[PDB]
Amino acid sequence: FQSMSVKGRIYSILKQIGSGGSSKVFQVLNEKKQIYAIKYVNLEEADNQTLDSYRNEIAYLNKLQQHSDKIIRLYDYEITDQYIYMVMECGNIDLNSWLKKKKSIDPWERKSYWKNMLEAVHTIHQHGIVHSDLKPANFLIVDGMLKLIDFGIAVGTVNYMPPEAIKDISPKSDVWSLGCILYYMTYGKTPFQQIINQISKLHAIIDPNHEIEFPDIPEKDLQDVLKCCLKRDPKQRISIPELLAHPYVQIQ
């Protein structure tokens, strides 16, 4: 029922998609009756460290547009000292919400999503970006295709957290997180979701004596991937280029 202006162009609000730290995401309709998502960021109580992190995310989102279709499309933006408006493509739903609703995940949709996740995370790594905070919420379903929504530059779950991030951070950090997302899509839980206590959870992730259970499934390829990603030592963990050449991703 409402309306907002981004670079002379008018957008009518359909619904509010999300909220957070001085930031509201909306589903909008433009003058050509096309659907988009607008993220509004209030900079009134924002400092220079915050502004430059936001400016850095917009710059990376803007550059990585051209390098991959697995990155959310950023159509337009308006930046002032009071706010930011980002006009982006609209997804159907985020991966976290889609997984929370779904009682079972189809092996084909799973393989397809995995491919998308590796291509997206691979792309950011080629530009010196390591996310380090990957979770299903950073992924959006856009016409059966997964897209990466942020680069960790600008939920606080810890279930997808690599052992190296706990120790106190290389492209291998993201492999651990992607492994945890695939583990959830495989077994219906993250490898440490059983641990109610958050400190015991952290003590279990770093501890090598704490064996991660990999139950036997029909897809033995999918089992090897999980076993390769979830190696507590970054040095002994599989790389993204090697994951893209794995039989799980490649064999039809």
Ligand SMILES: CN(C)C(=O)c1ccc(Nc2cc3c(cn2)cc(-c2cnn(C)c2)n3C(=O)OC(C)(C)C)c(Cl)c1
């Ligand atoms: C359970 N939820 C809230 C949903 O069903 C839901 C979730 C996501 C939706 N799509 C959607 C969400 C979107 C975007 C584009 N489309 C863009 C963004 C975005 C925010 N920052 N950056 C740099 C990109 N975005 C987004 O942040 O979505 C969440 C609020 C769900 C996390 C829609 Cl239309 C509905």
